[PDB]
Design a protein around this ligand. Structure first.
Ligand SMILES: Nc1ncnc2c1ncn2[C@@H]1O[C@H](COP(=O)(O)O)[C@@H](O)[C@H]1O
Ligand SMILES: Nc1ncnc2c1ncn2[C@@H]1O[C@H](COP(=O)(O)O)[C@@H](O)[C@H]1O
Ligand SMILES: Nc1ncnc2c1ncn2[C@@H]1O[C@H](COP(=O)(O)O)[C@@H](O)[C@H]1O
Ligand SMILES: Nc1ncnc2c1ncn2[C@@H]1O[C@H](COP(=O)(O)O)[C@@H](O)[C@H]1O
Ligand SMILES: Nc1ncnc2c1ncn2[C@@H]1O[C@H](COP(=O)(O)O)[C@@H](O)[C@H]1O
Ligand SMILES: Nc1ncnc2c1ncn2[C@@H]1O[C@H](COP(=O)(O)O)[C@@H](O)[C@H]1O
Lengths: 98, 99, 97, 97, 98, 99
């Protein structure tokens, strides 16, 4: 019955591990921005293989669960930095925290 | 067409690789529980980085929303700090009989 | 205000790292077929532990994730059901931006 | 931050206003059984027009909507499938606050 | 591809037609508030029958499709006014407008 | 268990009872279209009140998300002002064969 929010969204950012932004690993910059943006949190996963119609470059997935508006901000910031990968989003229910 | 269940939910427990319980790893204890409560199954992942050093540990469980809640109750207290999430999903297959 | 595709779904296939199909690592076989079929993409994860409903506990979980249009996913599931023994396949909507 | 129930779903049953089951208006029969079973609730709508895949065009649509926990909906669908001829039953999640 | 929003929510308010608030029909007051609240819009339906474990009182359903935050406001305003009925919410995608 | 489709979407077209097209009621014209494009089916509702006198008219269509989009294109222009919505749904049955 108790839930933090019912309009929470799960954002997933798929990029290659070697993708770069101004010489730095794109995922680190992305995670860096999320931090100074005051976003709830994030989890980064590294796949063992991946491919996108549109492998020395393992997949890295940056996942962020937050309120809708916050996630909209993030997409608007990160869209420019990503020329190859994908961004998905779907609702989810957050039950606990700390 | 055929599916296994259209009433299932995906439970995701986000904790810390270093989180402990009564002396043991919080994820190993949870999985033990889940296995003794008769849950459908579970899959544990370890991220490379996370913020909410410590590696994020995510135990995932897909089952009747009615087992998931049974699971939520028994774990809500053990998770002093972290996050629990849940959302619908359809289980299309398991692969017990081929035809 | 602009999303890439119409009706996309996220397929997740769970199997064992040690699973095989005709002497080959089942997941690589699955990924291969997906590519051949012309699927939008796929990501493969390796878990550190997992259990279901006779498999070694040291047999790590492998999750093959595919995000694509509905008919495509339908087609994928149609092709890989025969190769999934005692695993699991899930699907649910998502929006790809 | 407080929702009433865990895993609720919205069942929608589509049938014809003129449909019958043992000489009675099928929808009233469905609603009756739902009540007997102890279902959380139900709402019935009457459309002004509808068509599917031999029924009069003047035979208005009747939609029986049920919002309840998963197992309950499972049970409902199990009971009314036999009474639904050339209609439609849909389901999808929802959160009841 | 073109969509107004991806974090739109469909809110549904189920009450009886005779339900009242300070002597006026509860649904009219509800619709009245939504209007002076600047909400996107709303559609009211009247069922031909209904029942809630928790019929001379036909069901009235007030439906509102809007951004998440707006819908949160609405729930917070209307929750007090409703002692018998139900409030559901799930995501939806808005494609067009005017 | 068995279902009809887990890939379907529910399309909802909100217009005005008085909205017209080339001289006819916008909803009657849409339904005509939907029937000639071979869509699974449709259900039309008339609210008692709405604001976005005029009665709100809602044509609902459940079908492959691939027919729904075919439908969206052909109607987006006809709907000068109103609203179109879409979201997933599972079609559990149709009732053609009992067993
Ligand atoms: N449709 C998809 N489904 C699952 N994973 C995807 C999909 N599309 C892209 N990816 C992942 O994102 C990465 C794409 O990187 P890139 O090819 O440079 O655009 C791949 O390594 C995949 O693991
Ligand atoms: N209900 C479930 N929830 C999460 N993962 C599952 C579930 N069921 C099966 N799996 C995964 O699929 C595999 C099942 O194979 P097995 O242990 O031989 O039955 C495990 O390694 C799990 O990672
Ligand atoms: N909103 C979120 N989205 C994605 N991952 C999260 C989120 N919140 C927490 N996490 C992860 O879950 C773990 C628990 O949070 P913490 O106790 O602060 O370390 C962290 O290691 C994070 O990586
Ligand atoms: N679980 C439900 N599913 C569908 N409709 C419901 C449900 N619960 C309540 N309703 C509708 O909301 C109204 C409840 O009013 P009341 O009994 O006064 O609380 C009924 O007339 C029903 O049409
Ligand atoms: N795909 C659909 N979308 C919306 N309503 C439907 C759909 N299929 C069936 N229906 C409803 O179910 C009834 C079908 O019965 P029939 O016309 O005899 O085949 C119609 O009156 C519709 O209101
Ligand atoms: N956001 C919304 N939620 C529920 N109903 C709506 C919404 N927006 C528009 N409508 C309905 O759709 C119809 C079209 O809007 P309008 O052209 O302004 O009259 C109206 O009669 C409203 O009742």
């Amino acid at each position: 019955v108790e839930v933090e929010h019912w309009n929470t969204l799960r954002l997933r950012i798929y990029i290659g591990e070697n993708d770069k932004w101004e010489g730095r690993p794109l995922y680190k910059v992305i995670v860096e921005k999320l931090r100074e943006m005051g976003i709830a949190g994030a989890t980064v996963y590294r796949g063992i293989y991946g491919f996108g119609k549109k492998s020395t470059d393992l997949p890295i997935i940056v996942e962020v669960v937050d309120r809708g508006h916050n996630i909209e901000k993030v997409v608007n910031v990160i869209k420019p930095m990503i020329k190859d990968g994908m961004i998905t989003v779907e609702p989810t229910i957050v039950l606990w925290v700390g």
